[PDB]
């Protein structure tokens, strides 16, 4: 994303440090689904 196309004050939020966030974000979504599928099999007879 480019703030200030054409002007002396032109800067750009780069992708190299955003690609690292998407890496941690994937992980924290898999961990939070494994811990949901698991815990719903275990409590199948405990009427939630």
């Amino acid at each position: 994303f480019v703030f200030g196309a054409g002007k002396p004050y032109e800067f750009s939020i780069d992708c190299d440090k955003i690609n690292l966030f998407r890496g941690v974000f994937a992980f924290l979504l898999y961990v939070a689904t494994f811990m949901y599928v698991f815990s719903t099999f275990a409590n199948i007879l405990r009427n939630k």
Binding site: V37, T40, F41, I44
Partner: protein, 56 residues
């Protein structure tokens, strides 16, 4: 011990009906213990089934 001419056959017949009827009660008992076999099987099969979906 003297008795009339038909009494000994009334007494043998009143224990043929009893053994036949007590024979039917047995047949039906065994059937109802087969229902609790089908039921248990079903339950444990639905559990083993869900496992295979979720782990996939």
């Amino acid at each position: 011990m003297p008795v009339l001419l038909g009494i000994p056959l009334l007494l043998r017949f009143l224990g043929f009906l009893l053994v036949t009827l007590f024979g039917y009660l047995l047949t039906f008992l065994k059937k109802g213990f087969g229902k609790i076999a089908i039921a248990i099987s079903l339950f444990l099969a639905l559990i083993i089934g869900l496992n295979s979906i979720l782990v996939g």
